[PDB]
Amino acid sequence: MPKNYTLQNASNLGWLFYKDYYRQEPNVDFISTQGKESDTTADFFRKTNQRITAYQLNSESPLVAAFNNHFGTPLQLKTIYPGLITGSGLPHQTGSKGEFKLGFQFDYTTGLPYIPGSSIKGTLRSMFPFSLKDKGSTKRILPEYRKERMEYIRDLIIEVTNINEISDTEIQALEYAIFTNSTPSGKTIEFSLEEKDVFYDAFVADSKDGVMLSDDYITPHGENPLKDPKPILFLKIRPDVTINFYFKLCTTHLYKEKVCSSKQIEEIKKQNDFSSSDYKMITAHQKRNLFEKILLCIGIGAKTNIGYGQLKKL
Amino acid sequence: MKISKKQIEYAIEALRANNIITNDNQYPKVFKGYISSFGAAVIQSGLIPAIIFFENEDNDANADRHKIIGVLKDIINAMRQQYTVTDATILVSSQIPANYSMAQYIIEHGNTDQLLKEITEAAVAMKLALRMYKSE
Amino acid sequence: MNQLTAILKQHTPMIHFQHNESGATLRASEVKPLLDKFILTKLGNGDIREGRLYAKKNNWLIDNEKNYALNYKLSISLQKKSRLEYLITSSTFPLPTERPSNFFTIQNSPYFAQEKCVGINTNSTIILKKSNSDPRKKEAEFKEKNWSQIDKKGLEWQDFTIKIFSLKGDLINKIQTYLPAFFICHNFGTRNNKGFGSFTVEYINNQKNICNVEDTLKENFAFVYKKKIALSRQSTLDFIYIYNQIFSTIKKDYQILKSGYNFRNEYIKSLLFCYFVSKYPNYRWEKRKMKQLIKARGYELKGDHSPISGIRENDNSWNDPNPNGYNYAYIRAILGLAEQYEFQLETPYQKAIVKIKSANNCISRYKSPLLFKIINNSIYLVGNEINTEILNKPFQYSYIEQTKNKNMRTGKSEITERTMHINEIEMNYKNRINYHYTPTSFSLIDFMQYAMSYKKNGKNILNYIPLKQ
Incomplete structure (x- = not known):
């Protein structure tokens, strides 16, 4: 009831915070x-x-x-x-x-x-x-x-994958393939079902020894230092809490600075004039490492500029 | 939910009667955000918390936020004035007292779906009515 | 460069309100707003408007319209999570001989909140009861449960990292120049103006920082003074012995400028009070008229010596000289606004409380304009000019009598409050020079000159070296 949320003895935290909070x-x-x-x-x-x-x-x-x-x-x-x-x-x-x-x-x-x-x-x-x-x-x-x-x-791509050199057009194509699932323009690439990048919801995974929610204060002092401050109390996710990020990532095939489908890249490989120098491949694991590095760099959530939402490797 | 033209008329007269709309068909630009935030608060936190927050008069806000709650009360009164006899048997057709606190009126009358529906429709009507005039 | 990494060393234990978490450290929601103002001030060569124009020019602002915020990300983290927790009180008490190894105390400190943490009630962290055998010389007991439920703790950590991220390279390089100076010039935490949150930068991106503390304070502050602490031997108990001297000295030195010292047979006059008697308006502090008004009623105040008038050695008088009353003003406001004045009537178990209100709700608070800094066990008292808005403003005083009645056999409590019928001076009295109004003219640089050049018998009362005047 009081601790150890579970599914049999718990009160919906969103319910408590939003609907049951201001009960008369x-x-x-x-x-x-x-x-x-x-x-x-x-x-x-x-x-x-x-x-x-x-x-x-x-x-x-x-x-x-x-x-x-x-x-x-x-x-x-x-x-x-x-x-x-x-x-x-x-x-x-x-x-x-x-x-x-x-x-x-x-x-x-x-x-x-x-x-x-x-x-x-x-x-x-x-x-x-x-x-x-x-x-x-x-x-x-x-x-x-x-x-x-x-x-x-x-630099992040060179770090996470074996690609020695990447061009601006290649970076643009990779970004538009990962996030837009298209070409830089408006064109659609014939992608398979598994060749899609999906960003699931990050969930709180495990609060080892302690609660997962705590209370914090932001106390703005106005433009007049002679006036009283303004204590603002809010709810935060406690430190030392495990966050589970779920992704559905595929392998991106770049040939001559254009994003190719898996069968497209197979056909390109089978051709006689196949330049291995123009072929680049970033796998799902390397994509996950790239996303992990980005998250460890900037973090996620609100008030990230003043520190909130920074993550460390478990 | 479809907003009737009579509801928008009620919103216009209520925004003029309280003092949102000046005599030159202009309003302070912050009431737009006030009404949008009231709608968001009603949808998220609930009817009572939003009504209590925007009803407060001892604010640090730039303008008079409680006048939007006054406009709400006037629109709801105008809506209830046109309730049909068969509607009054199912719905409460009594007029909200002018000096009565809206939050305590809702609390004393419960949290019935009628009041929440009326508040949501009147808030949408207020937003549409403000969209017809110039933001200073 | 996109990332800036700095290693911070702690000089004084920060008063942190979120000490419960093991990762509790310096909060970036405090550092970033001050760092933004510091950089904008430095960019404009001492003016924040030119500095904002500079930041507006090279696209360094989050918003070009309404805020001082700069587009960078700040994170403060602990490398090693071993910390020392300090109990910081304004009252001395015997040390309890059962404490956690990381528990330490600063007996005499300027931090006077949380005075109930040491006393009688069961909610106190340290409980004092009369020792057996010999009377007096009570012994203390440590309650860990009350230690957990304390609002603020004095926390000192080992070296910890500050991470600054910005995709603008020129913003990062300008931050690198100003970051060592920013931390030297600022304190963080509760009661920071008394030197409780001093930090310095050691390694900037794995590079040892050489920033002279003296000249860094010189360029940023109008006046800087240095205090030579006693280089006592046995410098192995670095934490407690040194910290207790420094904060006791700061409380000693600060309660010389503001009010005076009254303990044993040792009296130092209020240097702020002495300052205003010397000048032309010849202002007398509101404490004098507070006592006179209370005596004008049937309330008698405890004291062997009459209220002090003027500067001379013995002018303990109750009445103004003769031709007319003295010129009175709220002298103590300029060095920090208070809320209540307690006068502690001689008649036991009852005291008089004077409440201070702004006589129109404009001045609710005022931070003390004097900043005490502690770097490498050296005390630097720095500051700038005071906010001129406090000067010449009215203040209403409510005189109420409080009687701490002798229990009721069950709860050991009182609720008595009675309004003393004090004949109040009119607001427009003496052309708005009454005792309700703050002084019209005051300069801190002039005051610090007079205060630390003051002498009676021999030597200086505030033994300071004037690095910058």
Whole structure:
């Protein structure tokens, strides 16, 4: 009940955080100004937060085991302490004392903290040169953006795979194949079912000895240092917590700076004028290593600039 | 959910009556975000938390956020004024008191689906009505 | 270069509110906003507007419109997770002879929050009870359960790494130049202005940093003074013996400028009070009129000596000279705003409390403008000019009498609060020079000159070397 989440004795963490958080109880008032600042409201929210922050996750969790069976072998990385925040922009605020002011990303069914696959895909793509859209507003920073990111991608690819030299067009084609599953343009490559890159949801895997959710403060001091600060309390994923990243990655075949299908590359290999110098191959394992390096570099979640969401190898 | 033209009319008169829309058909640019955030808060946290948050008058906000809750109350009152006799047997057709706190009204009347549906429809109507005017 | 790695060494134990986690270290949500302001200030050659224009020019800003934030990623992590936990109090107490090996105490420190952590109640971390056999000389007992549920702990870690990431190479190289200077000029944590969060940079990307602490403080601060601590022998207990002297000295030295020292037969006048008597307005601190007003009612205050007037050796007087009343002002506000004044009536188990409010809600707080820095066991007192907004602002005082009644046989508690009917000075009295208003003119550089050049009998009361005035 209080710890060891499981599936038989637990309260849905998202339910507790969003729907059951502001339940109306006798003698508890937070409609009036006096009620929102009262100690009774603070005690009520303290008890709710203590209920939220009391659950642990075992390594042999049937939930996590089912996730592993469905989505394959995970990439296990461990949280370091600033904490980890996801879904910070979700509205969760009334104006009371002792309540969680920022939002949190909970799975609806399981209730476990998780990172949506869209978040992981966007975070990984942001470190690739062609993530920024060529637009009127972005055209000022567009050249520097791609110039800076292309070098980073080049060194990372040379590190993770045996390719000695990679061109800018090759990097563009690889990025558009991994994330867009197309060519740099609008053209579609005839890909097989397994030749698709899928970014599943990252789930909290195992809190070894301790809870997985903790409370943290950000206390902005305004532009006037003579005025009072503003304590903002939010919910974070505790440090030393294992995060399971699930991917479905394939092998990318590059021939003459263009992305080729597996059968296409077989036919190209069978031809007489096959230049092995123009053939490049990045496997699923090397793609996973590339993504792992990106994640260890920048991290994932909210407030990543001020440290939150940084990962270490398990 | 389809927003009727009468609901948008009610929203226009409610935004003029409180004081969102100035006499020159302009409104402060922050009320757009206020209404969008109220809709998001209703969909995510719940009706009562969102109503309590946006009903608060002792804010640090740039403008008067509670006027959007006032517009909500006026739109709901106008909607209930046109409830049919057979609707009043199933739905509550009583008028919300002007000085009554909306959050405590909802709490005392429960959390019924009628109030939540009315609030969501009125919030969408407010958004559509603001989209018809200029952001200062 | 895209990554910047720095190794930080700790000089004073940081007061951390999240000590429960084993990876608890310096928080980057604190370092980054200050580092951004430091770099923008340095880029503009002391002006933050020119520095923002510089950052705006070379696309270094996250937003070009409304914030000082620079586009880099900051992470602070611990390499070895072995830490020393300190109990930092403003009250001396006997050491309990049963403690964890990493548990240490700083008996006399400027940090005066968490005073209830040592005392009588069962919630105290260290509990004092009257020792058997001989009276007095109580002994202390350590409760680990209360140690766990403490809001803030003094934490000192071994060398730990700071990671700065930015895809802009020129931003990283400018950060490298200013990073050693930033940490020398700043403290982090609770009560940082008294020297509780001092850090220095040792290795920048595996390169030993040679940054002279004296000149780094010279360029950034208006006045810098150096204090020679006693180089006592037995320098093997580096932590406790040295730390206790330094923080006791800081509390000693700071409670000379602000208020005075009153313990045994040793009295040093408030240097801030002495400063304003010397100048033309001849301001007298609000404490003088607080005591006079309370005596004007049927409340008698504990003290063998009358309130001090002027600077001369013995002017302990209760009444103003003759032609008219003294000129009074809130002198102690400029060195830190307080909330309550406790006066501790002679009649036991009851005291008078004076509450300070801004007389219109504009000034809620004021950080002390003096910064104490501790690097390599050397005490540097640095600072700049004060915020001019505090000058000449009103303050209402609420006089309430509190009686800590002799229990009720069950709970050992009191709730008594009574409003003393003090005849309050009008706000516009003496053309807004009453005792409600902060002083009109004040310069810190002038004050630190007068304060640390002050002398009675012989030598300096604040034994400091004036590196920069």
